[PDB]
A paper describes a structure:
The cryo-EM structures of the [name]-[name] complex bound to its native substrates Gln and Met are determined at an overall resolution of 3.2 Å and 3.1 Å, respectively. The local resolution of the transmembrane domain of [name]-[name] complex in complex with Gln, Met, or [name]-[name] in complex with Pro are 3.6 Å, 3.9 Å, or 3.7 Å, respectively. The binding pattern of amino acid substrates differs among the [name]-[name]+Gln, [name]-[name]+Met, [name]-[name]+Leu, and [name]-[name]+Pro complexes, despite all binding to the unwound region of TM1 and TM6. In the [name] complex, Met binds in a classical mode, establishing five hydrogen bonds with the carbonyl oxygen atoms of Val50 in TM1, carbonyl oxygen atoms of Phe277 and Phe279 in TM6, the side chain of Ser278, and the side chain of Tyr129 in TM3. Additionally, the α-amino group of Met forms a hydrogen bond with the side chain of Ser280. The hydrophobic side chain of the Met substrate is surrounded by a cluster of hydrophobic residues, including Phe48, Val125 and Phe283. The binding mode of Leu substrate is more similar to that of Met. Upon substrate binding, dramatic conformational changes occur in the [name]-[name]+Met complex compared to the apo [name]-[name] complex. Specifically, the hydrogen bonds between Arg57 and Tyr129 in apo [name]-[name] complex are disrupted once the substrate Met binding and the guanidinium group of Arg57 is oriented towards the benzene group of Phe277, forming a cation-π interaction, which triggers the rotation of TM1b by ~5 Å towards the extracellular end and thus causes the shift of the C-terminal end of the EL7-8 and EL5-6.
[name] ([name]) and [name] (SLC6A20) are special members of the SLC6 family that rely on the ancillary protein [name] ([name]) or Collectrin for their membrane trafficking. [name] functions as a peptidase that regulates the maturation of angiotensin (Ang) and serves as the critical host receptor for SARS-CoV-2, while Collectrin is a homolog of [name] with a similar tissue distribution, including the liver and kidneys. [name] is responsible for the uptake of neutral amino acids such as glutamine (Gln), leucine (Leu), and methionine (Met). On the other hand, [name] primarily facilitates the transport of imino acids such as proline (Pro) and pipecolate.
Author numbering:
A (entry chain B): 54 to 561
B (entry chain A): 470 to 519
C (entry chain A): 620 to 768
D (entry chain C): 620 to 719
The structure:
């Protein structure tokens, strides 16, 4: 909601990714979620023992879910690694990414720190040390092995025993972001460039939501904002007592997340707009300066409103001296839709607008602890969803404790996680992110949404939930389970298949 | 009366083709150091006669 | 020279009349006097009438050059005036409350200042303390279990 | 006048040679020029040779007085020099990095 949402919004303009997202939310995020909660409570087993009881040839879902929850967690942890690497570089009064370092010959800045921002020569050359091409990979970059080890150690120190040890970490690290986020919202809306970005978010380019790309992106994002088809919520809803009102919880969670999805878009665009209007004022000041340095006008006569007339008032006085100055061009609504991509949206925008506020060595630490304790929970759930189906497969002799299996999984994934710490490291991450977040999620979701209502019978499930909570579900759940949900899925599927051919595969 | 020397040296450069070797602010009067302008004599008679 | 008063002072910006030109010429004479005493060990009495000024403009710019005390045909070469100014720039700035970007000298650009902040690479000790707390948590929580069994 | 360099600057305290006396006399001439233009609306060209200085000492103290531009027998009364200095004190301080 902070790292993939605004990018997938900006690439599609910014206004065409809020109407489709919400329609797909209200139409698919809620019913499938309620379905999977209800099953997790009825069948009384984990994420694999369920799909192995319904027509036992359907045990594949118990393996596709495990494999995909592993492939996601493979890099959703190195992102946490980068975040805590940034968090370590705070605790110093002059922020490291606020100045360019000088070369061996102390006369000017290093080349690439001068031709670009001072904050891009901390993410692209000091943190990652990116090489020119994906086919070119070099050393191991120890100073990110340190952060990888620290991340995979914090995680294993928090989930040592499944439940009874995620309890307290959930008490702490699932309420902290909901106050730091408000603290940042209050600071964001009172900035200089607010109300110029959050109004850009809500203007729909009507001829953009008529392309299959935006629909496919909304479809693949509404299943990733939740954790449907990951196999994590089945297991969590397979513990509590039987006569529990499975509905209420479902609905409230569905409406507590889809609300915090437009409550983070507001805070992020309230900073993107600020940065854009700042760069715009800088371009305009540079133009004014290039004019007066060239014609010797007083200081306060060329201001932001009488500029065009004053520029016409010189060309008619020194025509040979005027046609030499190289003017810039800069208009708003062109600085907003700029080159902003994931892995570089929460590290290139928020880290340069965090150093232009008083007492920055506090706002930076608060923001990055928010991001860390916002991303840790997710990994809690994912590690539960990968550990549960393993010991339900009799892969380890049952006489061994649970700590040994959690430790083995952590060590294995850490040792595989050396692929993202090379020089050419950000490209591998971009690739895996794109494809493993896009394609398998929606096919698993459709397969389970079909299996539950057409292999288990919908009427059996109906009277089952009736006995559980105490009332048949309203007509809404019926219509959205029987026809609309699978039909929507098919559409998303074909759109993905029509958005893969005829679109070139390029990276930056 | 605060552009006397400015105009004197602008005209000198533009139409005579002669530049001053040291800049002269408004505390000078370079034309008044001529016999004819400090003693109140008309000067056009030297043009037309020629 | 090019001077920008509204940028630096913003408000409280005094007005640039002729007495400011007097003060500027005196500051340049002082800088020259300082340079020909701490480098070349002469003792030359530059005055504010040895600093000639040309092309005054509203933007608050102009040109100047310096001559030996009583010899109008003796121009100090430009590569020495540049060094004298490099040497006394910080006092010439202070006399006017300008700050080295509102008092540019057009061919003399500033560089003074070393960027040698970090003695310790502070992120290392923060990583050390977090590693210590995480390892101590790991052992205490894996020993809680063996105690409870 | 009494000047204390080691107190204010502490370190980095420049040395008070004769060029500093030149700069001080120029600052006082500027202050006088300012006062006889923003109060009395004259235009008088005080120079640094109109500021006479007596009794220099190591403590960095001395006396001074001001005379009209080319008239050695025309001393500006002290109650006007005091007002001109009251008016331009903050710039005279800045030229030297002293702090009142
Ligand atoms: C609104 O969306 C439309 C797409 O429907 C954009 O139109 C495209 O603009 C790009 C500009 O780089 C062209 O290369 C495409 O050929 C255009 N496609 C069509 C179908 O016109 C339009 O640019 C968007 N609005 C703005 C302001 O950019
Ligand atoms: C004024 O300066 C000029 C040069 O700037 C001095 O001229 C020099 O005079 C000596 C002897 O007359 C010659 O050998 C040099 O060649 C001259 N210099 C140049 C550049 O031609 C002149 O001496 C100075 N005035 C006084 C009084 O010393
Ligand atoms: C120099 O200053 C003195 C006073 O400081 C001026 O003397 C005055 O002269 C006029 C006419 O000569 C007398 O009426 C005044 O009484 C004089 N003043 C005093 C205090 O006696 C003198 O005029 C000034 N010099 C010039 C050239 O004007
Ligand atoms: C800096 O100076 C050294 C020695 O003077 C020189 O070898 C080096 O090339 C200079 N730096 C650059 C970028 O040229
Ligand atoms: C960054 O990578 C380059 C390879 O292009 C390598 O030469 C350099 O040593 C790396 N940076 C550091 C600080 O080692
Ligand atoms: C700026 O200067 C021009 C010419 O001196 C003048 O016409 C104009 O009015 C000035 N600006 C303002 C705001 O008065
Ligand atoms: C300046 O004026 C000339 C006419 O003298 C015209 O040809 C030219 O296009 C003008 N330039 C601009 C930028 O308006
Ligand atoms: C292992 S799930 C990764 C993150 C989490 N599922 C989310 O949607 O935020």
């Amino acid at each position: 909601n902070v790292w993939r949402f605004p990018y997938l919004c900006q690439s599609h303009g910014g206004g065409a990714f809020m109407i489709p997202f919400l329609i797909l939310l209200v139409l698919e995020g809620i019913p499938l979620l309620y379905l999977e909660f209800a099953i997790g409570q009825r069948l009384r087993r984990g994420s694999l023992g369920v799909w192995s009881s319904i027509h036992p040839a359907l045990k594949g879902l118990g393996l596709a879910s495990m494999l995909t929850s592993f492939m996601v967690g493979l890099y959703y942890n190195t992102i946490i690694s980068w975040i805590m690497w940034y968090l370590f570089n705070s605790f110093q009064e002059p922020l490291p990414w606020s100045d360019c370092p000088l070369n061996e010959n102390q006369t000017g800045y290093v080349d690439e720190c001068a031709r670009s921002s001072p904050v891009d020569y901390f993410w692209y050359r000091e943190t990652l040390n990116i090489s020119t091409s994906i086919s070119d990979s070099g050393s191991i970059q120890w100073w990110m092995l340190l952060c990888l080890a620290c991340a995979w150690s914090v995680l294993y120190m928090c989930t040592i025993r499944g439940i009874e040890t995620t309890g307290k970490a959930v008490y702490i690290t699932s309420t902290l972001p909901y106050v730091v986020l408000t603290i940042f919202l209050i600071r964001g809306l009172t900035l200089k460039g607010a109300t110029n970005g959050i109004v850009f978010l809500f203007t729909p380019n009507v001829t953009e939501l008529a392309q299959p790309d935006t629909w496919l992106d909304a479809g693949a994002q509404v299943f990733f904002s939740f954790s449907l088809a990951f196999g994590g919520l089945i297991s969590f809803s397979s513990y509590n007592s039987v006569h529990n009102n499975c509905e209420k919880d479902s609905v409230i969670v569905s409406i507590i997340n889809g609300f915090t999805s437009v409550y983070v878009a507001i805070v992020v665009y309230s900073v993107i707009g600020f940065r854009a209007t700042q760069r715009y004022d800088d371009c305009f000041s540079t133009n004014i300066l290039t004019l007066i340095n060239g014609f010797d006008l007083p200081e306060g006569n060329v201001t932001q409103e009488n500029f065009v007339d004053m520029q016409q008032r010189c060309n008619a006085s020194d025509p040979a001296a005027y046609a030499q100055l190289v003017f810039q061009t800069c208009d708003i609504n062109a600085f907003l839709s700029e080159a902003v991509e994931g892995t570089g949206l929460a590290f290139i925008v928020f880290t340069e607008a965090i150093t232009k506020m008083p007492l920055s060595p506090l706002w930076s630490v608060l923001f990055f602890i928010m991001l860390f304790c916002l991303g840790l929970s997710s990994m809690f759930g994912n590690m539960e969803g990968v550990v549960v189906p393993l010991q339900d497969l009799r892969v380890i002799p049952p006489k061994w404790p649970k700590e040994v299996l959690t430790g083995l999984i952590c060590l294995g994934t850490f040792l595989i996680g050396f692929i993202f710490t090379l020089n050419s490291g950000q490209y591998w991450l971009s690739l895996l992110d794109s494809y493993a977040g896009s394609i398998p999620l929606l096919i698993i979701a459709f397969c389970e949404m079909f299996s539950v209502v057409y292999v288990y019978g919908v009427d059996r499930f109906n009277k089952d939930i009736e006995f559980m909570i105490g009332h048949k579900p309203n007509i809404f759940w019926q219509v959205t389970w029987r026809v609309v949900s699978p039909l929507l899925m098919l559409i998303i599927f074909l759109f993905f298949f029509v958005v893969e051919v005829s679109q070139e595969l390029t990276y930056s | 009366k605060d552009q006397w020397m400015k105009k004197w040296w602008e005209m000198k450069r533009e139409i005579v083709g002669v530049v001053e070797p040291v800049p002269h602010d408004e505390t000078y009067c370079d034309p008044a150091s001529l016999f004819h302008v400090s003693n109140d004599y008309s000067f056009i008679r030297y043009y037309t006669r020629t | 020279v090019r001077i920008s008063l509204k940028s630096a002072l913003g408000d409280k910006a005094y007005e640039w009349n002729d007495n400011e030109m007097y003060l500027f010429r005196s500051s340049v004479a002082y800088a020259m006097r300082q340079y020909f005493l701490k480098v070349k060990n002469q003792m030359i009495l530059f005055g504010e009438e040895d600093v000639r000024v040309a092309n005054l403009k509203p933007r608050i710019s102009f040109n100047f050059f310096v001559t030996a005390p009583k010899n109008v045909s003796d121009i100090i070469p430009r590569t020495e005036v540049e060094k004298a100014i490099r040497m006394s720039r910080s006092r010439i700035n202070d006399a006017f409350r300008l700050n080295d970007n509102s008092l540019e000298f057009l061919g003399i650009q500033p560089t003074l200042g070393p960027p040698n902040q970090p003695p310790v690479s502070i992120w290392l000790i923060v990583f050390g303390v977090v590693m210590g707390v995480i390892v101590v948590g790991i052992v205490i929580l894996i020993f809680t279990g063996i105690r409870d069994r």
